[PDB]
Ligand binder design. Structure first.
Ligand code: HEC
Length: 97
């Protein structure tokens, strides 16, 4: 199955939808709309661009860098996602623009 399609399925099955919208609305977490390639500011005032590595780090190392003005509640369980699943989720995120 193509990665974007698997990533849409994982967005649902892995519960991302519960905290992250794809229509620009703020839920518990930030929307994925426009996320890839945007600049992020963290709780410490540092910034970074949301590139592939940042998305990967955000999913696989939850809680390591936290977007300012959000609670630090990314699930632990995603540290166990497989390489295909991470790649799929990222492909799905990149196309939310
Ligand atoms: C609520 C209990 C969450 C669930 C379920 C998922 N995420 Fe999350 N995420 C959440 C918050 C509150 C935040 C912001 C604080 C922080 O840790 O930075 C995030 C952040 C991310 C990011 C970075 C987003 C940005 O705007 O820079 C990514 C890429 C991300 N989250 C991905 C993600 C995926 C793919 C999830 C399902 C596997 C998922 N999150 C679930 C809260 C919650």
């Amino acid at each position: 199955m193509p990665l974007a399609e698997l990533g849409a399925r994982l967005y649902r099955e892995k519960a991302c939808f519960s905290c992250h919208s794809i229509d620009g609305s703020r839920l518990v977490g930030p929307s994925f709309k426009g996320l890839y390639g945007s600049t992020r500011t963290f709780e410490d005032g540092t910034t970074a661009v949301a590139d592939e590595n940042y998305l990967r780090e955000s999913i696989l190392q939850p809680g390591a860098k936290v977007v300012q003005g959000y609670p630090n509640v990314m699930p632990a369980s995603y540290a166990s996602l497989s390489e295909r699943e991470v790649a799929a989720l990222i492909e799905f995120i990149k196309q939310q623009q």
